């Protein structure tokens, strides 16, 4: 008999080509969400600094009424 190592009846195909999923929410939508999150941070910054100026005027009233 013959007992080499033969290819056993043919072998299935091996993938042989590039494959790129290329996703990632192309520049329109992600550009938009970047500017939108930036605007959200701006508006919260505006509100908090106005409240902070209120508090700073109260501390000014403290130093004024203390002084004499």
């Amino acid at each position: 008999v013959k007992q080499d190592m033969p290819p056993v009846g043919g072998y299935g195909p091996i993938d042989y080509k590039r494959n790129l999923p290329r996703r990632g929410l192309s520049g329109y939508s992600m550009f938009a969400v970047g500017i939108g999150a930036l605007l959200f941070g701006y508006w919260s910054m505006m509100r908090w600094n106005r409240e902070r100026r209120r508090l700073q005027i109260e501390d000014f009233e403290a130093r004024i009424a203390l002084m004499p």
């Binding site: 013959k2 080499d4 190592m5 033969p6 290819p7 072998y11 195909p13 091996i14 042989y16 080509k17």
Partner: protein, 54 residues
């Protein structure tokens, strides 16, 4: 391999990539697609292997 097949390279089928400019970026990419063609040649060589003689 395509011009003077000095062996059984003629009985296997592939396609060699060519660079487009002298830029070594092209040279690099040519090496990568030669690797992928090497995988194709190994696939066909396991497909059509004869159990002849050492």
């Amino acid at each position: 391999r395509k011009t003077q097949p000095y062996d059984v390279y003629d009985q296997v089928e592939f396609d060699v990539p060519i660079g487009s400019r002298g830029d070594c970026y092209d040279r690099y990419l040519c090496r990568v697609e030669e690797m992928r063609q090497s995988i194709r040649i190994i696939s066909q060589c396991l497909n059509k292997m004869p159990p002849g003689e050492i």
